[PDB]
């Protein structure tokens, strides 16, 4: 299927990406992980997102998430994600064509015991996909939790 | 990876399924669709769920959803789903080993303009996967909306 006009500005995402990241948060000792992301489409104004992580040393599976990115030609975007840990997120924000960036903040986090808000920011940097995930809790204000860089395969 | 002990009671789901369904709802004329579901795992206490639908005549893509099923040995289960239309759901309920059934009701529906609650019920019937999805809105009480039967591939 052809790329939908609403998806075309984000066509740089389409494909599979692999790299590594680092997590750290108050009370959570720093850790590293491997990550793979696939962005795909079926001609609708939606990009399917699938992600998995693993332990570096072994490749042992860790977590997974999946969802859908819905860009619109005014530069707005909404993203819905379900996580293997049992959370859901509704993310809203904007994309910037000049910067090849996507900036999202949660409108909703569902089924979480502690997390209150999640922000997600993507940026293409020299053709690599970077992101920062920031998290808040009732007692910890929004702050970095995960960051990764992935190469396009 | 081996099947996790918490997943084993639902191992009958694992694989790919294809069939067809029918939708109908107040103000929504009846329609039919094709459907494919895959259930998979990576050795964690989680089953990954991916689904797509299409038009019967042509096979043209329609919608998609994906998420995660988290069964527990007391017979409880939670399910998180993200939909290509831009919704999320947190579903909670129970599974029954004798009946090979799973009965879920939403604790949360996110980003919906009209839907308030969603219930999902699966049943293995002569080795085929059946479900009923029921939906409510502010003015329409919970009632059937989608039903499908799928053969295991």
From Swiss-Prot, chains A, B:
One GO CC term on file: cytosol
The record, for Pfam families, names: THAP4_heme-bd
Known EC number(s)?
5.99.-.-
Per its UniProt record, the required cofactor names are:
heme b
What does the note accompanying the cofactor annotation read?
A: Binds 1 heme b group per subunit, that coordinates a highly solvent-exposed Fe(III) atom.
Q: Pathway membership of this protein?
A: Nitrogen metabolism
Binding residues for heme b, per the UniProt record?
27, 145
Q: Where is this motif: GXWXGXG?
A: 15-21
GO molecular function ontology, one term from the record? metal ion binding
Q: What is known of its domains?
A: Forms a 10-stranded antiparallel beta-barrel structure able to accommodate a hydrophobic ligand in its interior. In fact, this fold hosts the heme group, which is located in a wide surface cleft.
Name the family: Belongs to the nitrobindin family.
Summarize subunit and interaction data from the UniProt record for this chain: Homodimer.
Name of protein: Peroxynitrite isomerase Rv2717c
């Amino acid at each position: 299927p052809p790329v939908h006009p609403f998806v075309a500005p984000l066509s740089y995402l389409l494909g599979t990406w692999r790299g590594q990241g680092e997590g750290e948060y108050p009370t959570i000792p720093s850790f590293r992980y491997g990550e793979e992301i696939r962005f795909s489409h079926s001609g609708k104004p939606v990009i399917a997102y699938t992600q998995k992580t693993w332990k570096l040393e072994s490749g042992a599976p860790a977590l997974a998430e999946s969802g859908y990115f819905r860009p619109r030609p005014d530069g707005s975007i909404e993203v819905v994600i379900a996580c293997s840990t049992g959370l859901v997120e509704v993310q809203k924000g904007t994309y910037n064509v000049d910067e090849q960036s996507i900036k999202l903040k949660s409108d909703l986090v569902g089924n979480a015991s502690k997390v209150k808000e999640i922000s997600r920011e993507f940026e293409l940097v020299d053709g690599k996909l970077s992101y920062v995930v920031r998290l808040s809790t009732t007692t910890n204000p929004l702050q970095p939790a995960l960051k990764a860089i992935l190469d396009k395969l």
